[PDB]
Every structure is written in C-alpha cells, then in structure tokens.
Amino acid sequence: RRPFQQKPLQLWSKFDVGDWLESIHLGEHRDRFEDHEIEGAHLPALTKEDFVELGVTRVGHRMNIERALRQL
C-alpha cells in the first residue's frame, strides 16, 4: 500500500507521482519527474513537449501515462 492510493490526484506530492509512476510500470521516469517537481495537480496538464522534457520520449509511455490518468 502507498499514499497515492489514498488521496485525490490534486493532493499528490512529487513523491506520490513517483509512487504512481512505478505502480503503472514506469519507475524509470521517477527520478526525472521528481527533479522537475511534477505534482499530481500537474499530471493532467502535461503537453507532449513537457513529456519530452521529462524524458518520456516513447509514444507508448505517454499513452500509458494517459490511460492511467483517466482511470483516476
């Protein structure tokens, strides 16, 4: 169990995003989204060029990240 499972998207600290990323099998991105201090409130406003800057250069990852967003 982890605190992102327990609080709304908009209250996710940068550490919570990192927890959620790993939960969707994208922990490879956890440290670069943490240095950019991406928060939960940030996740639904990320543009494709944001995702590149965050190093999510693979289409497949972008789309997994965004299937998961809607599941929330």
- Output the domain CATH number for residue 23: 1.10.150.50
Alpha carbon distance 16, 22 (integer Å): 10
**Alpha-carbon span 19 to 47, nearest angstrom:** 21
Among 38, 48, 47, 46, residue whose Cα is nearest residue 16: 38
Distance CA 11, CA 59 (A): 27
Q: Could you identify the residue written with the tokens 């989204």? A: 33
In a domain, 9, yes or no: no
Determination approach: X-ray
Within a 13 Å sphere around the CA of 10, how many CA atoms are in the beta-carbon half? Answer: 0
> What is the phi/psi pair of residue 63, to 5°?
-75, -25
- Residue 6: inside a domain, yes or no? no
Distance CA 11, CA 57 (A): 26
């289409």: which residue's tokens?
Answer: 59
Answer yes or no: is 10 within a domain: no
Per the domain annotation, does 65 fall within a domain? yes
Other beta carbons within 10 angstroms of residue 10's beta carbon come to 11
Identity of residue 61 = H
> What is the stated resolution of the deposited model, in angstroms?
2.8
Asked, for residue 27, whether it belongs to a domain, the answer is yes
Phi, psi of 56 (to 5 degrees): -90, 70
Helix (H) or strand (E) holding 44: none
